[PDB]
Paper text:
In the cryo-EM structure of the putEC, the putRNA was located at the opening of the RNA exit channel of the EC adjacent to the β’ZBD. This location is consistent with the put-inactivating RNAP mutations and potentially would restrict the RNA hairpin formation in the adjoining RNA exit channel via electrostatic repulsion. The modeled putRNA from U2* to U74* contains twenty-one Watson-Crick (WC) base pairs and five non-canonical base pairs, A9*-G35* (Saenger class VIII), G12*-U32* (Saenger class XXVIII), G43*-A64* (Saenger class XI), G42*-U65* and C44*-A63*. In the putEC structure, the ‘V’-shaped putRNA binds to the prominent β’ZBD by its pothole formed in the center of the ‘V’. The β’ZBD fits snuggly to the putRNA surface, generating a 1130.3 Å2 interface area formed by ~33% of the total putRNA residues. At the backside of the putRNA-β’ZBD interface, the N-terminal loop of the β flap-tip helix makes significant contact with the putRNA with an interface area of 281.6 Å2. At the bifurcation point of the two stem structures, β’R77 locates like a wedge to separate G35* and G36* and forms a cation-π interaction with G35*. The alignment of the EC structures according to the core module revealed that the putEC structure is most similar to the non-paused, active EC conformation, having the lowest RMSD values between Cɑ-carbons of domains as well as the smallest swiveling angle of 1.2°. In the putEC, the active site region of the RNA-DNA hybrid exhibited a post-translocated state similar to the non-paused EC at the high threshold value of the map. Instead, the phosphate backbone of the putRNA is located near the RNA exit channel, prohibiting the RNA hairpin formation with its negative-charged surface.
Lambdoid phage HK022 contains a cis-element, put, which suppresses pausing and termination during transcription of the early phage genes. The putRNA transcript solely performs the anti-pausing/termination activities by interacting directly with the E.coli RNAP elongation complex (EC) by an unknown structural mechanism. In this study, we synthesized the putL RNA using the Eco RNAP σ70-holoenzyme initiated from the native HK022 PL promoter, and captured the modified ECs using a transcription roadblock for cryo-EM analysis. Cryo-EM analysis of the putEC prepared by promoter-dependent transcription initiation, transcription elongation, and LacI roadblocking revealed three EC populations at sub-4 Å resolution: (1) the putEC (3.2 Å-resolution, 36.9% of the EC particles) that contains well-folded putRNA, (2) the put-less EC (3.6 Å, 22.4%) that does not display any well-defined putRNA density and (3) the σ70-bound putEC (3.6 Å, 40.7%) that contains both σ70 and putRNA.
Numbering used by the authors:
A (entry chain K): 2 to 84
B (entry chain I): 1095 to 1342
C (entry chain J): 16 to 933, 948 to 1126, 1136 to 1373
D (entry chain I): 797 to 845
E (entry chain I): 499 to 647
Amino acid sequence: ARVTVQDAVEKIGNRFDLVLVAARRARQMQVGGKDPLVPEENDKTTVIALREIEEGLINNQILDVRERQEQQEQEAAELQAVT
Amino acid sequence: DIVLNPLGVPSRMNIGQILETHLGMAAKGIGDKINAMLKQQQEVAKLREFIQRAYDLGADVRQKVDLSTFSDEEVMRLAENLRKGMPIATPVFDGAKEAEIKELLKLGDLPTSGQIRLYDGRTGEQFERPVTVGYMYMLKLNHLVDDKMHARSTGSYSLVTQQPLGGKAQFGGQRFGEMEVWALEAYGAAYTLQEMLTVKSDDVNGRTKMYKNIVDGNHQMEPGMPESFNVLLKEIRSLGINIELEDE
Amino acid sequence: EFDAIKIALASPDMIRSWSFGEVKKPETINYRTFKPERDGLFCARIFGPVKDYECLCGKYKRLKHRGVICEKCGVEVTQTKVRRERMGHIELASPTAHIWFLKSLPSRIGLLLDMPLRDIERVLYFESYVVIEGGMTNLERQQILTEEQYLDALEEFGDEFDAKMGAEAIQALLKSMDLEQECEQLREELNETNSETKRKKLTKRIKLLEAFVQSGNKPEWMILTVLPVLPPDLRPLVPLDGGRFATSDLNDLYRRVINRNNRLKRLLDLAAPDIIVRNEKRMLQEAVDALLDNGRRGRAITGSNKRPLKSLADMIKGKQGRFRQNLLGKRVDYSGRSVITVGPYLRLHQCGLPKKMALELFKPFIYGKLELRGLATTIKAAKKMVEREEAVVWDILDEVIREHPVLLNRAPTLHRLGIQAFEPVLIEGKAIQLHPLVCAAYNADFDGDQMAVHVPLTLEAQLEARALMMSTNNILSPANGEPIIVPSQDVVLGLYYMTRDCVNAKGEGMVLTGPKEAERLYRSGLASLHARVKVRITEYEKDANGELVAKTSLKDTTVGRAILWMIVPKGLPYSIVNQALGKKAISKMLNTCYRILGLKPTVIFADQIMYTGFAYAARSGASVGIDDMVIPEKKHEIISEAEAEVAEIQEQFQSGLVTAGERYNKVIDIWAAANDRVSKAMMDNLQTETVINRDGQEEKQVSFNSIYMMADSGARGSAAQIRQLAGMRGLMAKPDGSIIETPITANFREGLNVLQYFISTHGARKGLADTALKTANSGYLTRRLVDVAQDLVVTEDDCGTHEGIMMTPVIEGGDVKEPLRDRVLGRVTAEDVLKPGTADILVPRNTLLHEQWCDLLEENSVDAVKVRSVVSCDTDFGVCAHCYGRDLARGHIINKGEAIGVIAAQSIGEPGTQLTMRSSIQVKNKGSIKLSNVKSVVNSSGKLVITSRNTELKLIDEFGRTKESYKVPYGAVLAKGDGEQVAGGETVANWDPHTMPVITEVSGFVRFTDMIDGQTITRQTDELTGLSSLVVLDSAERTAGGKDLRPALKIVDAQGNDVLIPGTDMPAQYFLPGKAIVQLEDGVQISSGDTLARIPQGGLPRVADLFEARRPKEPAILAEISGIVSFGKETKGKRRLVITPVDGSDPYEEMIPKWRQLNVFEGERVERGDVISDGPEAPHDILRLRGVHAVTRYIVNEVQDVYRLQGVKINDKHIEVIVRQMLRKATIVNAGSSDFLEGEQVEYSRVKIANRELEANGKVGATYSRDLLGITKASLATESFISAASFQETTRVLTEAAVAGKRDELRGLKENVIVGRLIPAGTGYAYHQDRMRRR
Amino acid sequence: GQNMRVAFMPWNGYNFEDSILVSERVVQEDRFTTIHIQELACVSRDTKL
Amino acid sequence: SAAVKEFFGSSQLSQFMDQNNPLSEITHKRRISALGPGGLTRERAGFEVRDVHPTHYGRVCPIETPEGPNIGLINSLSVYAQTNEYGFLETPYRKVTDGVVTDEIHYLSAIEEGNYVIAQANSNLDEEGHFVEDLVTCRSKGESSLFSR
DNA sequence: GAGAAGCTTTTAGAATTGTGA
DNA sequence: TCACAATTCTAAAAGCAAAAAAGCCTTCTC
RNA sequence: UAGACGAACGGCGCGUCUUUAAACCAUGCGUCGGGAGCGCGGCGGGUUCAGGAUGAACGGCAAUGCUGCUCAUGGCUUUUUUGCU
Ligand SMILES: [Mg+2]
Ligand SMILES: [Zn+2]
Ligand SMILES: [Zn+2]
């Protein structure tokens, strides 16, 4: 549950970067099938993403490096299967 | 029966409603005494004496109602009509006076202050500060909430500009005017604004795709460019002007 | 997909290339079957199929046929939406002139040819002739002939004479003219103009020609030969109920023009005579001109009943054109309305949404969940299940609502708090339940208002609603710092009744262990809610960094204050609960809570405050009765006294000892005094009425009268209302504004009688009309501010600058209107603040002056600061986060991206609905004295007399922070000296108002230099005194012979050797004007300070005019250079006046009228920014002469005056940014090594960046003078035409852009709003920066 | 209209700004019930086919 | 037929009856409007026409006019107001002869109201119709003031 | 009948011309 | 010549919503 | 009752006639329907030329058909009144 996003804002000090980061993570959860990194409490994907940002384990850097890593492992699976 | 707010009296200087409340309380007190007499079945002597006392108080007032001429049969009819409260006529700029109101209150067994003691309905506790109770004439204006409510998910759209129709009569959407557009620009609400400008009003393929996405548990829009802008482009090319969208 | 919009003129070949076929017949449809008909305005052969994937005749229908053009009928089987995109054309038999490029004023065909407008107008409409190619004859080309002269020329000149008529002649002229040779020749001739009026004309014409040859246009494209036709589906012939048809008006106009074209083709085919073909060409011209813009020619043709029928320009123009109706604002799906009620149980991030509206707005989400759960396989089954409103749909609906926000909106969205996001709670009913606290933000009461609710669909819109627009984020206003979640009226009444004290209440003077025991005592009944008590209260100071220390002690309080102490969070003190807690006190409580603790405590605290205030307002039982309006017991005595005095004055007038006006003023003043006495008696009786005892004699305390507590808590009402209820309601003005003599001595507790009520009705009707007709003026002003400032965004962190405005406390001359603590709160210092001791860095030079730093400044008592200002920012195309400063709605520095022009315009405009629409220096306090710009000498009396027109004084405290300022004109009798100390109330100076002294720095005898007894002077002895003197006269009455003999006087010594001006070696010749009555004749040794020659003498529209930058009708003429000034020649039109500098040259001379009491004599100096004649001043002069800081400070002060007189509070950032957006152009003086013309007016950022990069090498830059435009001109004269055309003057803007061949890269907010993409301001800043990074 | 019994006091914020707090006894007695008569026209036309 | 039907059916001053109350009907019938064909307009109306003139007294109500745009132009006609043979509003007064206040009713128009001193309705009368107190509040030339008996 | 043939706002800015030197 | 100034033509004048009614060229047939 | 015709074909409708293709209308009556690409030809429509109102050729398109290869199967304007700012 979320009433205020000030704790989430304090760890991304723009308040317009928060919207885009949380949108990326929430779209991942909703469509990408990714598993939430925090327990679900009958929250929606947007609130779950904002809670994750509040905890301090999602931001632009973490998302970028995770995307790079998973793309690299999928490519590595291709490479192992083919060579 | 009804509870109003005292704060509407000082700023909105309508003292007439408090005076109406007091005089209505007095009238209903007279009617309550008449009902008490007319219930514990009495004789017409006491009723005519009391109604005469009620009709013959005040300063030197125009009307003289004498019940010695009423033949004792329509005095009971009059009392039956008066058991709901004695009607009172208070002409516009020569009406009653607070002394007359206090005298009429004292005719009944009401307090002259106009304010009685009340108790809380759900805690049984006396409110402090005696409150002004009385009878006020309430009107029901013809602005009913079941004629004002209206909502729409989707419907039909105009021909020339593929936008929702406007009105409750022809099922239609709300105008998101330019002042609301400014207020959204004053936040950082760029995506809300884009969706309200394209996928909820004009962009036809975008809004069909948005519907199909929503029903499929996916919340994402295809931007597109509004059809009203194309209508404007054609309306401007129909002059000699040649307005064109440059390359990528 | 695209980056810009290019506007230009359409060639006939280009129009033919847009076309799909050429329209020939006026007819539209058949009326047997409503299918189209060939070569009509609706034609399947031209404009595409009627039905999808079908041929009109019916031959081609298969999927294998998509594309084939049928041979039977010629239609192309394809989508019918193609009707919405295909244009035709009409081949006009004769060329025709486009109305816009002819009659736009300026005329783009007029000045291009240099011909005047009316001659071309006569030529086009076949009323006269025009020659071309004069040849070897004495007739030039562009001159105009007429019928008789044409006949004469033709008979006397052979075939080699081309004289044509109508648009064909205009086209021939336009095509024969070569552009390059004319441009070069006229540019060459321009250099020898000598700077007369004609120069301006030339710099217009050239600006056309070059701008008309740089782009790929030719002149003859302003004359129509082929005419496009709008696609059929944009001018539809919809059927209706019956056999008729609801046609559009464009169809009628096209039918008319096609009719006339066909007739003209017929006549030209059958070799008609000249008269009839002339008439028909004229009529076709009129038809086309009606089609393109119906009404610019003679009276607009009327369609059917009485209404001029719409043309294309009408469909583009106006408040109901495409721009303002369908692109800048739309109708939207997923939206609803209803009436609003109050829900006092909600938390302030919630609203109550009816179940019916919720189910109607969230249908697709419900379908999604239904198909997800499997409760309905196909979509139609889910649709029908929802239509039957089953028992499972409601749990789904409660699951598609949990954390999904909705936007609530009230009709006039004056500022950005008229839209807010809430988390719906489903409610059984039909009205939306709105939280009580957010009602102030909306300006919504609950007497019938409605509210519109919108649903955000996409995921980013939900995040934006949850993060930017949620009602728990918007607790502070953006117009100022102050909160907007202050409790309104019942909460404050409850907290004022609860936190109060009675001098002897039940259970007084016992000792308690804490708030909890106080509450138990009160609830159980053993004590009164406000009885004085001792309570042990533990309060937590968070003085230790991130650490709370819990002080405990015994405090003398009341039971109600102890009960209220429970809500208050940890960090706050007990000094905030230990008072009466009116409205301002609660506002300060919430403010300090926010600034100390944070956000979440403030939100929870506000909710708890609302709950407890409502609860204890219910418990109090506060009512209002008739016996709570206590009349003064002494009212009739005062009224009898005042009436007797009025009768005494009336008797005084009846005997004719007084006039009318002074009787009027005596009456008005005595009645006003009586009114004030009655008011004072009423309030003194009311406020302290209650008198009560503790243990003996009666003490007295503050009144528990209901109306007193209502008007004292700040809950509702003010002293004026309590005045009108109890004391007399005073004096009323009639419609003319003349105050009626007889007041209304009756008050509303008693009755007004008929006459008094009638006067009250005068006043009431005036007020209601004023409001109802000023709402629109405020709306127009707000629109203009938004459309000038909308494209200004914060786009950098630092410009790297030191310049900034000098902010000081603002004093009109009495008490300080508002301190320095309020001005520079949240501004960034530009140049460092020095400790008042000596040259010590007190705070660094890039601090954000928050509460700590400002309090430090206050305790150290700094006089003023220099702060970074937006108008002085060197960032181009936006501002930097530091010059703007703090985000007002938030607590931190402004974020990169935020759009501050829209919020500035909204802050200035929203309070516009509260504004209206229709001696000697007596010091106040004791302190040191200072003066500046003072030129004075000692007189015989030992005082000091001043010889300057800009002299002032300050009374200053013992710390140097100024307290009082005043202004002293030329020649005042100073009562003290500089640097001394005075006493409170000590008069410091005095003057003689109506006379203008000519006091001398020197003294001696007088010389009668150059007077003729009868012309220079006319003796007029002071008959009633006895003595006589000379009376000098002006130049407007004497004869021409003595007119040049200027009447003057001079002071000399005994011997006559001229006494020279002090400081130099020249005599002091004091030249005088007329009416300069020289009382002191020769033989009188004068003294300094002696009068040589007596010289006897809005509301909201004010703001609108200040932002329009309108020059007044009596401007205070300023001075341009230093050095000795002089008079000029003897009044050729205007009295000439010359200035002479010392370092510079003296060609400068000004043409001043003869209706000004000038401030300067011949023998006196001036300076840039001096006044030559007082009066209201022009901002243009301030910008040109004094500077840019001068004009911005001037405008800020003169707007804040209006906004502070009404009790409104706006920050000074907003006016500063609107000023920045006004002064935005610049005219180049020196072309330099750049490519700018002699006097071209160019965007200031353009020349700034141009010369900035040009000075990379050693070349020279340019010189510019900034122009001050209004808000209509500053927004119309922008570089982007899409913005300007959607605002005002669509025809002018589009013609200018089209002939100029302009190109619009969007770059703005309104432009991206129209084309339906992300604005480059908020959450869309990142995407636009990304796009700019890929170029 | 109808002549109702009134008390001028605040009550738990339910008559906060201009709202009114009615009792159920006003609705049970149908003191403010009104009758509204609509009209609905079905017009059968001479259409093609 | 076309002209009379155009007047009665589709005209600015021939408007749909306001009918949900007897008061609504009766006060719609006694309604004066400064708009219409031959009158001014809502936006072209200044403020001197939007206002209560002193000669409205007894002929036009000051406190019954619709709020919003057309305030002051949709005036309502007083209880005793009437009309001359020429079309000017008039209102009834009682002749006051020789101090005694008789009961013959004269109907005065605005251009006759200015040549008399009209006493006030609630000015006290004693038996046989004298003014009990020796000086009364009146209005003589578009302005109220206090006059001898 | 059905189907065509064809008589009053107010303010303000910018462009003429109409004397005026 | 080249400058003020009276004329006059052009633009603009808040937002949102509810209900109702009247209409959607002249005319010329034979 | 059935048959035929009405810009290619089929059903249905409508109009007309009775073994016949006419008459009616004149982007030659109305509504609906054709699994697709390549290939064969070509109703219909046009280009060129001549001939002297007539005729030869033509392939960008293309109707009833034929063989073979590949594939999932829905309203706008004016007026009036009202409501909230
Ligand atoms: Mg309201
Ligand atoms: Zn076809
Ligand atoms: Zn800066």
